[PDB]
Write a protein that binds this ligand. Structure first.
Ligand SMILES: COC(=O)[C@@H]1[C@H]2CC[C@@H](C[C@@H]1O)N2C
Ligand SMILES: [Zn+2]
Ligand SMILES: [Zn+2]
Ligand SMILES: [Zn+2]
Ligand SMILES: [Zn+2]
Ligand SMILES: [Zn+2]
Lengths: 216, 219
């Protein structure tokens, strides 16, 4: 079975510069008809794979001309010219010379850009959930960069670490930033035993953490 | 134009059988194209499962042994996927596509369908509105959200104002815990549009045939 390796990530590329993504095969993909059967796909988060290149260098219909492919027999390159925010996602190559057809592991295009402070919002539990016996306090940290971020919860001044769930989105297709959701879950009774709830974010964009809070 | 669309159960118990359907419109499947099934595991790994061409010819991935079968109903322009004795390792997103002799698929891929193999039970989600505590700085932006908690299995579709509200929306991946998922979504809008204009989050959970529309109202 033909194995195709791809680097997990690319060095971050600035919107505007050109980048090259590689793919290597364990066997040659040149067919007895003189054509090399290698495909290049781009998959955006939540989207289905979309063909960019087939036959190693032919661009698919409707595909932007900023995309071009080349290669020998075991080494292939996809060149993306004048990279833009929209190109973010994972790039896969696929061999179509021998059965079973196989895909490479995928290379995620990481975009580099100017640092940005996240917009922080904190939400008290809803009255609907409070009737169920549960209580979730939610905190949203939107559109920040770089992806590295630290969130801390405090109840009445003291740090609480249990009952906290976090979630991060993929790099944004429009402005190349990251977003994150942080949820603190307590029982309704526990939530009632306190008054001050705080969400603290620590980012590279500031020495002092961004703090958001409310009083029950 | 040509369109492919997968359909099938979203949850299956281990050892049982999996059946999926791909409906093709705008093009006949009795043609000599490789109407194929591909799947993507959690982790993004893609695997070729097999294909059917010219109505009566097929080929399958050897790793699927003798538990896969691909057939078609010409009168409905549909081809199917059958996978027997599944295990949790068969949990993935399933896609149908149309490959040609040269490997070109064009934009002929379905939206994909999620299949989970688990003994856990289907549970509808509870949708809770997230409105800000008090009034923030006026003449600016305001973020609202929805918390979709306790459902199984994935996925769940979340939209705002039936889709008419698209920009400024962030839906975060779900976090699994105790056989139950929790997901959140935020939307940012001018402090003017809200609460003057109504903002509603629409949540649909296919596995339970449930739909919820929760309007966001000021505290
Ligand atoms: C396993 O069969 C194949 O790969 C064939 C050959 C000929 C063209 C292309 C696609 C076919 O399925 N391949 C290079
Ligand atoms: Zn091998
Ligand atoms: Zn965004
Ligand atoms: Zn307490
Ligand atoms: Zn049509
Ligand atoms: Zn029939």
């Amino acid at each position: 079975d033909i194995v195709i390796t791809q680097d997990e990530l690319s060095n971050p590329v600035t919107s505007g510069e050109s980048v090259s993504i590689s793919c290597r095969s364990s066997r040659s993909l040149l067919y007895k008809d003189g054509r090399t059967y290698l495909n290049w796909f781009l998959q955006r988060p939540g989207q289905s794979p979309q063909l960019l290149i087939y036959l190693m260098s032919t661009r698919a219909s409707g595909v932007s001309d900023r995309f071009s492919g080349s290669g020998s027999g075991t080494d292939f390159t996809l060149e993306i010219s004048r990279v833009k925010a929209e190109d973010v996602g994972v790039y896969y190559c696929q061999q179509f010379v021998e059965y079973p057809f196989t895909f490479g592991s995928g290379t995620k295009l990481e975009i580099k850009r100017a640092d940005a402070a996240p917009t922080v919002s904190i939400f008290p539990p809803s009255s609907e959930q409070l009737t169920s016996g549960g209580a979730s306090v939610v905190c949203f940290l939107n559109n920040f960069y770089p992806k590295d971020i630290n969130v801390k919860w405090k109840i009445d001044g003291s740090e609480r670490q249990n009952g906290v769930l976090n979630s991060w989105t993929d790099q944004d297709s429009k402005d190349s930033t990251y977003s994150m959701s942080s949820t603190l879950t307590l029982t309704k009774d526990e939530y009632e035993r306190h008054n001050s709830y705080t969400c603290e974010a620590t980012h590279k964009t500031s020495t002092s953490p961004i703090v958001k809070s409310f009083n029950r | 134009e040509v369109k492919l669309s997968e359909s099938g159960p979203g949850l299956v118990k281990p050892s049982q059988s999996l059946s999926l359907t791909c409906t093709v419109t705008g093009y006949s499947i009795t043609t000599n194209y490789a109407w194929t099934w591909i799947r993507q595991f959690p982790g993004n790994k893609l695997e070729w499962m097999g294909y059917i061409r010219s109505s009566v010819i097929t080929r399958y991935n050897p790793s699927l042994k003798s538990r896969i079968s691909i057939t078609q109903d010409t009168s409905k322009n549909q081809f199917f996927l059958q996978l027997n004795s599944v295990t949790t390792e068969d949990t993935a997103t399933y896609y149908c596509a149309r490959y040609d002799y040269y490997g070109n698929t064009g934009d002929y891929w379905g939206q994909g369908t999620s299949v989970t193999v688990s003994s856990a039970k289907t549970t509808p989600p509870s949708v809770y509105p997230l409105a800000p505590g008090t009034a923030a700085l006026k003449s600016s932006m305001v973020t609202l959200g929805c918390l979709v908690k306790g459902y199984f299995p994935e996925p769940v579709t979340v939209t705002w104002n039936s889709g008419s509200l698209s920009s400024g929306v962030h839906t975060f991946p779900a976090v699994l815990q105790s056989d139950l998922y929790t997901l959140t979504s935020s939307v940012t809008v001018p402090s003017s549009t809200w609460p003057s204009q109504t903002v509603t989050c629409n949540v649909a959970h296919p596995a339970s045939s449930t739909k919820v529309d929760k309007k966001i109202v000021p505290r």
